[PDB]
From Swiss-Prot:
Gene Ontology, cellular component aspect: extracellular region
UniProt effect for mutating H12A: Loss of activity
GO terms for biological process, alphabetical: defense response to Gram-positive bacterium
Role noted for this protein: Endonuclease that catalyzes the cleavage of RNA on the 3' side of pyrimidine nucleotides. Acts on single-stranded and double-stranded RNA.
Full protein: residues contained: 27 to 150 of 150
Lineage: Eukaryota, Metazoa, Chordata, Craniata, Vertebrata
Annotated gene: RNASE1
Family classification: Belongs to the pancreatic ribonuclease family.
Protein known as: Ribonuclease pancreatic
EC number(s) stated in the UniProt entry for this protein: 4.6.1.18
Length: 124
């Protein structure tokens, strides 16, 4: 039974690469992080920064989350991210994703002690 912090790491952290360099990145990563077991997760963002740099966002700019909660934080600097989105032809179990690499600010919701990211809200 995964903790919220561990689920965030599994779904969103990829410090092993600086950026997605292939159109197939999302297909491979969505599968290896077990996000296509039982259903295709329709949208997911991976962050290519160190875990410490992403945890540090919980001490940066406090902003509202999309849902109206006030425990969201926007990174002061841009970060390397990859957006993974199902294509229109995708359907379980042959999940298919479009890979879009970008450099953007990230917005995360933080909770707990230690106070760490538990939800990826958006990128700007
Ligand atoms: Cl897993
Ligand atoms: Cl996401
Ligand atoms: Cl402020
Ligand atoms: Na947690």
């Amino acid at each position: 039974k995964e903790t919220a912090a561990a689920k965030f790491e599994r779904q969103h952290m990829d410090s092993s690469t600086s950026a997605a360099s292939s159109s197939n990145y999302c297909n491979q990563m969505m599968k290896s992080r077990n996000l296509t077991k039982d259903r295709c997760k329709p949208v997911n963002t991976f962050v290519h920064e160190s875990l410490a740099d992403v945890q540090a966002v919980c001490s940066q700019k406090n902003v509202a989350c999309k849902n109206g909660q006030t425990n969201c934080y926007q990174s002061y600097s841009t970060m390397s991210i990859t957006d993974c989105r199902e294509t229109g032809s995708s359907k379980y179990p042959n999940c298919a994703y479009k890979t879009t690499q970008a450099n953007k600010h990230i917005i995360v919701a933080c909770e707990g002690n230690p106070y760490v990211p538990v939800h990826f809200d958006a990128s700007v």
